[PDB]
Amino acid sequence: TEEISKGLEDVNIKWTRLTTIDGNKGILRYGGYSVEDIIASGAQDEEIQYLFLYGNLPTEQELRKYKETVQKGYKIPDFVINAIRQLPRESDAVAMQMAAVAAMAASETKFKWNKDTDRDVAAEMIGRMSAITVNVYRHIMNMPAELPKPSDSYAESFLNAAFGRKATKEEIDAMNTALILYTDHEVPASTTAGLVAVSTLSDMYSGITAALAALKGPLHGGAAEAAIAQFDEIKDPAMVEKWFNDNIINGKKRLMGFGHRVYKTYDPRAKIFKGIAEKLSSKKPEVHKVYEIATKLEDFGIKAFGSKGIYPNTDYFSGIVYMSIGFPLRNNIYTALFALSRVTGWQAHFIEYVEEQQRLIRPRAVYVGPAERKYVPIAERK
Amino acid sequence: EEISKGLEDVNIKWTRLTTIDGNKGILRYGGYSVEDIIASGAQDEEIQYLFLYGNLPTEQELRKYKETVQKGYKIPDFVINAIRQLPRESDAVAMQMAAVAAMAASETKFKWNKDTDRDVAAEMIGRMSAITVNVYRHIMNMPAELPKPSDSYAESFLNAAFGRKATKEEIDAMNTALILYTDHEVPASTTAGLVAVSTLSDMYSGITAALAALKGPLHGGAAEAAIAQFDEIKDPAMVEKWFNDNIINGKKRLMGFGHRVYKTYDPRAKIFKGIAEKLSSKKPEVHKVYEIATKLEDFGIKAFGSKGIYPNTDYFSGIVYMSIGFPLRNNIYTALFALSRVTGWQAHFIEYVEEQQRLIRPRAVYVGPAERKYVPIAER
Numbered sequence: 066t067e068e069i070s071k072g073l074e075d076v077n078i079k080w081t082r083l084t085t086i087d088g089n090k091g092i093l094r095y096g097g098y099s100v101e102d103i104i105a106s107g108a109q110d111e112e113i114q115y116l117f118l119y120g121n122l123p124t125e126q127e128l129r130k131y132k133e134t135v136q137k138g139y140k141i142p143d144f145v146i147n148a149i150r151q152l153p154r155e156s157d158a159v160a161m162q163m164a165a166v167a168a169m170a171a172s173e174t175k176f177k178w179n180k181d182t183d184r185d186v187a188a189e190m191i192g193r194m195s196a197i198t199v200n201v202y203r204h205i206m207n208m209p210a211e212l213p214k215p216s217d218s219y220a221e222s223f224l225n226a227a228f229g230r231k232a233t234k235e236e237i238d239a240m241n242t243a244l245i246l247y248t249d250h251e252v253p254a255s256t257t258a259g260l261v262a263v264s265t266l267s268d269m270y271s272g273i274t275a276a277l278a279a280l281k282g283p284l285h286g287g288a289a290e291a292a293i294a295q296f297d298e299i300k301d302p303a304m305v306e307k308w309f310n311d312n313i314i315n316g317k318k319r320l321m322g323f324g325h326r327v328y329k330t331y332d333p334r335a336k337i338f339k340g341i342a343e344k345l346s347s348k349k350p351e352v353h354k355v356y357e358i359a360t361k362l363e364d365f366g367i368k369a370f371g372s373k374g375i376y377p378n379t380d381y382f383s384g385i386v387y388m389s390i391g392f393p394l395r396n397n398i399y400t401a402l403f404a405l406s407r408v409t410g411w412q413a414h415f416i417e418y419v420e421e422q423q424r425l426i427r428p429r430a431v432y433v434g435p436a437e438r439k440y441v442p443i444a445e446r447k
Numbered sequence: 448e449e450i451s452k453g454l455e456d457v458n459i460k461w462t463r464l465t466t467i468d469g470n471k472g473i474l475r476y477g478g479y480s481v482e483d484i485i486a487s488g489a490q491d492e493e494i495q496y497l498f499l500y501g502n503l504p505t506e507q508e509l510r511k512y513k514e515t516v517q518k519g520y521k522i523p524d525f526v527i528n529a530i531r532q533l534p535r536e537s538d539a540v541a542m543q544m545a546a547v548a549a550m551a552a553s554e555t556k557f558k559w560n561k562d563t564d565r566d567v568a569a570e571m572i573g574r575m576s577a578i579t580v581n582v583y584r585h586i587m588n589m590p591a592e593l594p595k596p597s598d599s600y601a602e603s604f605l606n607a608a609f610g611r612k613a614t615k616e617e618i619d620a621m622n623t624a625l626i627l628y629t630d631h632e633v634p635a636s637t638t639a640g641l642v643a644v645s646t647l648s649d650m651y652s653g654i655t656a657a658l659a660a661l662k663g664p665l666h667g668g669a670a671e672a673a674i675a676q677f678d679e680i681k682d683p684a685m686v687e688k689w690f691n692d693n694i695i696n697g698k699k700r701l702m703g704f705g706h707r708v709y710k711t712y713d714p715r716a717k718i719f720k721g722i723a724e725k726l727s728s729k730k731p732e733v734h735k736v737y738e739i740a741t742k743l744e745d746f747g748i749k750a751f752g753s754k755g756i757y758p759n760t761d762y763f764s765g766i767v768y769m770s771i772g773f774p775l776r777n778n779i780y781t782a783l784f785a786l787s788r789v790t791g792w793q794a795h796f797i798e799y800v801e802e803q804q805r806l807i808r809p810r811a812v813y814v815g816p817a818e819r820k821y822v823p824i825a826e827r
C-alpha cells in the first residue's frame with residue numbers, strides 16, 4: 066500500500082491475553098481481573114507479577130516459591146551498580162536505569178529464549194529491577210550503594226533499601242498499589258519499542274533497554290513530574306481559579322496529567338490513586354496542600370474538557386502518592402518508579418510474543434525522495 | 448480483528464532518504480544507486496552528508512562537515528569505562544549499547560531542534576567511531592585509544608582500532624563497507640529507534656533502542672554466522688555434501704541468504720562479492736573461505752532462488768572484514784554494521800521528529816480470559 070499508518074494508530078501488532086483497556090467505559094483488566102478489584106482485595110504486587118508471567122493467580126505455595134526466585138534478583142554485579150554511579154548525578158533516573166540494564170544485557174551472554182526458563186529469568190529480573198532502581202535513587206541522592214533484602218513484601222524490600230529506613234505499613238501498601246497500577250498497559254510506546262527489539266530474538270534485557278529508551282521521552286515518561294510542577298506553580302489552593310484562567314483558558318499552558326489517547330473518560334488508575342493520595346497526604350500538611358490544589362484544579366479541568374473526552378489520567382495523582390511515600394521531584398524519579406512497575410508487563414509481553422507469535426518486525430516507508438540521479442565528482446559540484 | 452504480523456507491508460513513515468526495489472534489486476540513497484556511489488569512488492563522509500543534508504556536499508561543505516564529525520573523536524572517560532567494565536565475552540554490539548546508553552544519560556541538554564540536529568548527528572557519527580575502536584580494543588585486551596583526524600573517516604577508524612597505519616587497500620574496503628551499511632530504510636533496528644524517538648526521547652536513546660534490536664540473531668550476527676558456516680564446510684570439495692546434509696534436509700538455516708524486502712540478489716552482496724574476491728585473493732587462507740562461499744552460493748541460488756531467496760549483504764561482508772583484519776569473535780562484524788548504520792538511524796530519527804512526529808502507539812487483539820472476580824489467595 067501507499068497509505069501511512071501514522072503512529073500505528075489502531076494497527077494490531079500482536080494478540081495478547083495479558084491486559085484489556087476499555088477506553089470508553091474506563092475499565093482496565095489484567096487477565097480478566099479489574100484493577101479496582103485487585104486493589105480492593107489487598108493483593109500483593111507479587112501475586113500480580115505471577116499473574117502476568119503464569120496466566121493465573123498463584124496458590125500460597127506457588128507464591129512462596131515465586132518470591133524466592135524474585136529475591137535472587139536482589140543480588141546484582143558491582144559493574145551494574147557502577148554503570149549507574151559513574152554517570153552524572155543530573156542524568157534522568159530512567160536513563161540511569163537504561164545504562165544499568167544495557168550493561169546487564171552485555172553481560173548476560175547465556176540468555177536464550179526457552180519456554181522452560183523465560184519465566185524464571187523474568188522473575189529474577191523483576192528483582193534486579195528493584196536493585197537497580199534502589200541504586201539509581203541512591204546515586205541521585207548522593208547516598209551509598211544499597212541492595213534490597215528478602216522480606217515477605219517486594220514493596221517493603223524496595224522502600225526499605227531505597228530510603229535506608231523502615232517503611233510504614235501505609236507507605237508499603239501505597240507502593241504496593243502503585244506497583245500493581247503501573248504493571249502493564251497493553252502496547253504503549255515503551256512496550257512497543259521492546260517488542261521490536263525482541264522480535265529479532267534479541268535478549269530480554271535488550272528488550273527492556275529499548276522500552277526504557279522510549280519511556281524516557283516526555284510524551285510517555287515525565288507526566289507525573291509535570292502534574293506536580295503545575296500544582297507547585299499554583300502554590301495555594303485559593304489561587305487555582307486565577308491560575309486556571311491565567312494559564313489554561315488563555316492557552317498559555319497545557320493542563321498536565323489530563324487526556325489520554327485510549328481513555329476518553331476518567332482513567333481507572335487515576336480514580337484509585339486519587340483516594341490513596343487523599344489518605345496518604347491527609348496527615349502531611351505540605352502534601353495535603355498539593356492534594357487540595359490538585360482536586361480543585363481537577364474540577365475546573367473536567368468542567369472545561371470532560372465533554373471532549375479529556376479527563377485526569379494516572380499521572381495526575383500518582384505524583385502525590387510517590388511524594389507522600391517520600392520520593393522527590395528531581396531527576397524524573399517518578400518515571401523510574403513507572404519503569405520499576407512496568408518491567409513486569411514489558412517482560413510478560415516479550416515472552417508472549419517470542420514464545421507464541423514470533424515474527425521479525427520489519428515495516429516499510431513511503432518514498433517521497435528524489436528520482437534516480439547520477440553521482441557527480443565533488444570537484445564538479447556547485 | 449486483523450493482526451499486522453511483523454508489520455509486513457505496513458508504512459510507518461514517509462522518507463526521502465532511501466528507496467529499495469525488492470524485485471529489481473536496487474538500493475538508492477537520496478536518488479544515487481549504491482553501484483554508482485561505489486563505482487564513482489565516493490568518500491563515506493560524502494554519504495553521511497547526503498543523509499543528514501539531502502544532497503552531496505561541495506568541497507567547502509565537506510571540509511566543514513569533517514571537522515564536526517571529528518569533534519566526536521573525543522569521548523568522556525566514563526563512556527570508555529561503560530565498555531571496559533563489561534565482561535570481555537560480551538557481544539561487541541552490546542558493548543556499544545552500554546556505551547551509548549551511558550552517553551544518553553549524560554546528554555541532559557539534548558533538544559530536538561532543526562538548527563542543531565544535524566551537528567549533533569555529525570558529532571555522534573565521530574563518537575560512534577571512538578566507541579567502536581574501544582569496543583574492539585576491550586575485546587582484544589588492548590589499551591584504550593581514540594581516533595585522530597586523518598585523510599578519511601575510514602582511515603581514522605582502522606588506524607585507531609588496530610594501532611597501526613592501515614593500507615590504502617584496507618582503507619578503501621572499509622570505506623565501501625561503511626557506505627554499503629549506511630542505511631536500509633526501516634529494518635527492525637531503525638524501527639525500534641523510531642518508536643523511541645516518537646516519544647520525543649533523545650537521539651542517543653534512539654540509537655540505544657536500535658542497537659537493542661540489532662543484537663538479535665534475526666537482524667545482527669549474520670556476517671559472522673555466514674563465515675561460521677563456511678568454516679564448518681572446511682574444504683570446497685565438501686560443499687555439496689554439507690549442503691545436502693544440513694540445508695536441503697532443513698537441519699540448519701542457510702546463513703546470509705534471504706531478505707524481507709529483496710526477492711532477488713541483494714545489490715550490496717553484488718558489490719561485496721567483487722571486493723571479497725579481490726581482497727581474499729591476496730591471502731590464501733581467506734581465499735579458501737571465498738572459494739567455499741562461492742561454491743555454496745550456487746547451490747543456494749539453485750535451491751532457493753525460485754522462492755525469492757538469494758545472497759544478502761551479510762553473505763560476503765564477513766570475508767571483507769576478515770581481509771581488512773577484523774576477527775570473527777564476539778560478533779565484531781555486527782558492531783561494524785552498527786558503526787556504519789548509525790548515520791541512517793540518526794537521519795531517519797531527525798526526519799521523523801522534524802517533519803512527521805506522532806507517538807507510535809499500536810493496539811493488540813485481546814484473546815485473554817473474560818471478566819472474572821478476584822479470589823483471595825487463602826481460598827485458591
Ligand SMILES: O=C([O-])CC(=O)C(=O)O
Nearest residue numbers: 249250252253254327808
Ligand atoms: O497507554 C499508553 O499509551 C500510555 C500509558 O497510560 C501507559 O503506558 O500506562
Ligand SMILES: O=C([O-])CC(=O)C(=O)O
Nearest residue numbers: 427630631634635707708
Ligand atoms: O533491511 C532489513 O530488513 C535487514 C537488512 O538488510 C538491513 O537492515 O540492512
